[PDB]
Amino acid sequence: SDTISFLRGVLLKRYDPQTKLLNLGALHSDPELIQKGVSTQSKMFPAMMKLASTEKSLIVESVNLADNQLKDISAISTLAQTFPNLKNLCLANNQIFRFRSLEVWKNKFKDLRELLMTNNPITTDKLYRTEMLRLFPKLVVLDNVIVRDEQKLQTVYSLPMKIQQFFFENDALGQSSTDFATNFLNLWDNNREQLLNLYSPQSQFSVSVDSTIPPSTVTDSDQTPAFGYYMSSSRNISKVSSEKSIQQRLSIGQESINSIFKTLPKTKHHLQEQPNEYSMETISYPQINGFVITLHGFFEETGKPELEYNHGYNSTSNNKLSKKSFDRTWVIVPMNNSVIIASDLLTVRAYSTGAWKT
Amino acid sequence: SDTISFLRGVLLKRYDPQTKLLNLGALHSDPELIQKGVQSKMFPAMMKLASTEKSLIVESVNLADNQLKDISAISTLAQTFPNLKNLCLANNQIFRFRSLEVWKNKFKDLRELLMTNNPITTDKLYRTEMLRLFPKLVVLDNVIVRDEQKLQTVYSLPMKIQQFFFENDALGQSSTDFATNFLNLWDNNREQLLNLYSPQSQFSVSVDSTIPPSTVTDSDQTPAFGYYMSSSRNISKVSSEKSIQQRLSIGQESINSIFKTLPKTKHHLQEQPNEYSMETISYPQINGFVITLHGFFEETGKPELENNKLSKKSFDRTWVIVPMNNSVIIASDLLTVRAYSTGAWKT
Amino acid sequence: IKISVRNWQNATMNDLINFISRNARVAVYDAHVEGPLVIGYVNSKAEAESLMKWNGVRFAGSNLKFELLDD
Amino acid sequence: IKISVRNWQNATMNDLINFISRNARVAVYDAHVEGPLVIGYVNSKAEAESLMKWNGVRFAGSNLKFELLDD
Amino acid sequence: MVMNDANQAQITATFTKKILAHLDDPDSNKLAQFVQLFNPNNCRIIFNATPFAQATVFLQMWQNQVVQTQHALTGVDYHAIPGSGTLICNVNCKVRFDESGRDKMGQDATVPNKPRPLWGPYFGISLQLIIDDRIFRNDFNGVISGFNYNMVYKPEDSLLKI
Amino acid sequence: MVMNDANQAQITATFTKKILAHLDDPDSNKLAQFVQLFNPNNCRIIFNATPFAQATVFLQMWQNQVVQTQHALTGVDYHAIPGSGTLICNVNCKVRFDESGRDKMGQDATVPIQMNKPRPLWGPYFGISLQLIIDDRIFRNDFNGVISGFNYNMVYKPEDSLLKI
Ligand SMILES: [Zn+2]
Ligand SMILES: [Zn+2]
Ligand SMILES: [Zn+2]
Ligand SMILES: [Zn+2]
Ligand SMILES: [Zn+2]
Ligand SMILES: [Zn+2]
Ligand SMILES: [Zn+2]
Secondary structure, X not given: XXXXXXXXXXXXXXXEOOOOEEEOOOOOOOXXXXXXXXXOOOOHHHHHHHHHHXXXXXXXXXXXXXXXXXXXXHXXXXXXXXXXXXXXXXXXXXXXXXXXXXXXXXXXXXXXXXXXXXXXXXXXXXXXXXXXXXXXXXXXXXXXXXXXXXXXXXXXXXXOOOOXXXXXXXXXXXXXXXXXXXXXXXXXXXXXXXXHHHEEEEEXXXXXXXXXOXXXXXXXXXXXXXXXXXXXXXXXXXXOOOHHHHHHHOEEHHHHHHHHHHHOXXXXXXXXXXXXXXXXXXXXXXXXXXXXXXXXXXXXXXXXXXXXXXXXXOHHHHOOOOOEEEEEEEEEEEOOOOEEEEEEEEEEEEOOOOXXXX | OHHHHHHHHHHHHHEEOOOOEEEOOXXXXXXXXXXXOOOOOHHHHHHHHHHHHOOOOOOEEEXXXXXXXXXXXXXXXXXXXXXXXXXXXXXOOOOOOOHHHHHOOOOOOOOEXXXXXXXXXHOOOHHHHHHHHOOOOOEEOOEEOEOHHHHHHHOXXXXXXXXXXXXXHHHHHHHHHHHHHHHXXXXXXXXXXXXXXXXXXXXXXXXXXXXXXXXXXXXXXXXXXXXXXXXXXXXXXXXXXXXXXHHOEEHHHHHHHHHHHOOEEEOOOOOOHHHOEEEEEEXXXXXXXXXXXXXXXXXXXXXXXXXXXXXXXXXXXXXXXXXXXXXXXXXXXXXXXXXXXXXXXXX | OEEEEXXXXXXXXXHHHHHHHHHOOOOOOOEEOOOOOEEEEOOOHHHHHHHHXXXXXXXXXXXXXXXXXXX | OEEEEEOOOOOOHHHHHHHHHHHOOOOOOOEEOOOOXXXXXXXXXXXXXXXXXXXXXEOOOOEOEEEEOOO | OOOOOHHXXXXXXXXXXXXXXXXXXXXXXXXXXXXXXXXXXXXXXXXXXXXXXXXXXXXXXXXXXXXXXXXEEEEEEEEEEOOOOEEEEEEEEEEEEEOOOOOOOOOXXXXXXXOOOOEOOOEEEEEEEEEEHHHHHOOOOOOEXXXXXXXXXXXXXXOOEO | OOOOOHHHHXXXXXXXXXXXXXXXXXOOOOHHHHHHHEOOOOOEEEEOOEEEOOHHHHHHHHHHHOOOEXXXXXXXXXXXXXXXXXXXXXXXXXXXXXXXXXXXXXXXXEOOOOOOOOXXXXXXXXXXXXXXXXXXXXXXXXXXXXXXXXXXXXXXXXXXXXXXX
8 A cells, every 4th residue: 555655656757748658668777666676576567557547637648668678568468458549659679579469459559550669579570560550450650660641541440520419401490400309308208298289180100119239338338228118119110020010000190199109108308408418410301391300319217108928028127117218200390380290200229328429 | 984985976976956856776777886896785775875865855766677576675765765755666576565564654655656567566456555555645557546635635634733823913912022021030030920910810730741652753751740740730630629629829929839839940932933832812701812822941940949850841821811001910820731842833 | 893994906915914013003813805905804893993093094105994894 | 354346236235235244154344335336344364255255146136246455 | 191001111121221231332333323312403411410412422422431331220110201202211220330441442551352341349320211202113213302321329449430 | 709619620621521522523413513612603713823713614624624533631721710701721632633544424535446434543643732711601501602712723743643734
């Protein structure tokens, strides 16, 4: 407990905030360290890495490990766990000759741009460049020579546009979509019935369940979702093999729309409170003289539905109330004082953090 | 040394300056060459001297009746007269296609070719191959094989590039004055330029890391953007969203800071006017005008504050200026720094 | 390393070789006549450049000229 | 001596401590919540290994994870 | 009057699958056909809340500045809207990108036999389509009026930066 | 007060990319839409220090008298100017020309003595500096007649290119 406090000091000394560089080169040479330490040379590296990780307020985009008298990466292999987004690295003046060790760092340091292995024996190997380009996907410069064109590399690993949470053709549609969305959702949460004035006899509404589980790497994804209450009403043409049901699952008229509305769980949408958790798109729909409003977000499940297997069914897990992520699309037709929903298409899916988040 | 003077003599005798034609046809017939005794190794040497002499500019070459079975002996021609327009290889014994393959994408400006009495003329693939090998070939064996009009229109832009464009001559004079004064002040004393910036006026620098193709004359294949990378506001490269916001400098103070962050330089505008291109246009929305200047500058000194190697650079600088009758104020100043490369407007 | 000499005509070979070995501080061990110009081999390049410095020297009513196989 | 417990969620701390005190017949005397994982101190190392034996046990819809914190 | 038909549903679903297949296809030749699906006169395209007025630019950008993709249809629902002469499709699907570092041409960013693509982790996609009813009559020329493509969730370990 | 926003920046970048893509489009039909981006009443266009009075004429020249091209954005910076209601963008990019010997129609210059279209062979890269003066309305996702200023100039040329400026 006492010992760690010193090492904290050494690191702070070796870190520069302006250049964002941590100089961990030549630890054997630092006089402060020799009096205090060395036969324990192996246990200091990972400890220092952990201590580097635990202490916030130091952000490193560059690390120097030149001349640490390492034959193998092992002692510092843990670096990948500490600064995974490291951009520059120098390992010069070291005795590393084999490739076996570096295999620990495959698919790690994905944002590494520069690498310096100038005086290390590996520089002799013919497969050196190839293997290094294999090991560090975004590497641009290797031993001070350019090995990848930043232009192409940038174009390849990025889409033409950075994602945005909102798109509106004109500001009017923006204000209108916002108003409609907030109001509709508040009503959808608290009293489903009131919404029925927005649907005509021709208006249609259906729900589609996406049973798909997002990748675990996705931040805050729900790896065990529960679509108990929804599965009965799901109108997913790809998933539901029953062709006869799909005809029935579509709800037309305020009556059937209300029935399905009662069939769905009671919810709460924090659009006003947590605006960053929602993305919306609105576009013109000339064929109906209207607009299309698509809303991607999440909602909390407060109450069981107002309305309501062969071998084994359990109400506890499958019907557990939990927040869900959703994609809802309203095809709306404007009138002077009022609006009518031509179509309402909902998608219910396991909760997952928005791709629009930054 | 002994042979070269003689060969030089033969070349000089066989070259005609007015027609710009080098007649190396029927060398075996030349009594001067027979007088010595000469044989295969002679051509490339003659080519080397042809390159070395530089007092001969050749748009047409005659190599008729040199008893050549393959181009190998004269291939060096491509290295000596790459801009050749006319070539004659008639009355020679060339029969296979292998030899000419050295010359693909070479002699790009070759217009006429004569392979009369050469066996290759018999082959069906002859025309196709000749058309492939010489992109701008118009005449082959005295018959037209390509339309000059279309060929010209396709491989050239509608307008010849120009070094200067000004809406009015007055704008020309004013823009030139502004450029020279601003740049001289920019070179020698950075602080004074602050007199040209308002509190709302903004300035930022963008680094273009792109390396020009080696084929570009006098291009810097190994650029060094050490000092600039810290202040660079290149929205395309830098994915970091906050930095781009930070990189922008508003007001003479921050503008001064970045002016201090950049290396001390020198622009030889007055000395070398041909090394710079400028465009000036009206800016009605602000009742001012825009001056875009493309050129180069030398890096004399390291920045006054605190890869990092000093090197000659090419630049694109755009000033949005709003005139005030006493003095002028820069609404916006947009600089782009890139590796040195000769102007495309150059000849 | 192959040495050629011209404009030695009207004078003898041995005298020329000795003359060169006198002035140019370099000796050619085996020298071939080969018609108008003398051919010889010198052991090292330093002697070849040193030998090449003595170019245009007056000898037997004319000025010698020295040359090498590959420029 | 220093004990950390994870995957105790869905049940109260009291249930966890009593569960351990029932099954493993070893008690942590002062147990602190400290966010997601429960911290407690046990008197001896023998009790710590014995307690560590009960690692893959099912508890409140999840499997406990036990650790001896060096920190 | 409102249309509810299983046949039309099959047509719709399969057409969606065809569109995703068209997206995933890197072959430049077939691209020419892809543009045929979109209405040249009036079309509304959206990609990550970035608009596209005409399909050509969008598809050029897709062909050039986006790597080869692999779509996996997770969900589809559609409403045929009477009087509109059109139908609207709410689609949800997963996507994998070729994170080899090679574009559709197979050209590397490295400075100096068909290669296999290295698929990255899955991305979440929500796609809204406005199509003409004419597809029920085997007509696919200029049927796509609305194309709203947006990402709903992203994997952190992906090398692709949206 | 000065406008500085990352959203606006991304909008600018992607729009610029869109402009270059629009240039890269060889199909003659859609041309009419491209003209929509330029202000019909007042517009200032320059190409290699050669001016064009109307966007129609410029794009006609581009469509008729220029081979198929491929642009690649290398750099972009912008300043939104308060009170002007406009922003100015300093752009730098690379260009490739279709040096096949075929025009946008795909017609060869070969004199004839004898549905899958052939692929273009891309020439060496050209260096371009493009200055854009645009209305701020693009930040409100409005692109109709937004381009008032368009200054396109070549900064460096590769010698081995078959294209002659
Ligand atoms: Zn040492
Ligand atoms: Zn170093
Ligand atoms: Zn003859
Ligand atoms: Zn002739
Ligand atoms: Zn100078
Ligand atoms: Zn505690
Ligand atoms: Zn467009």
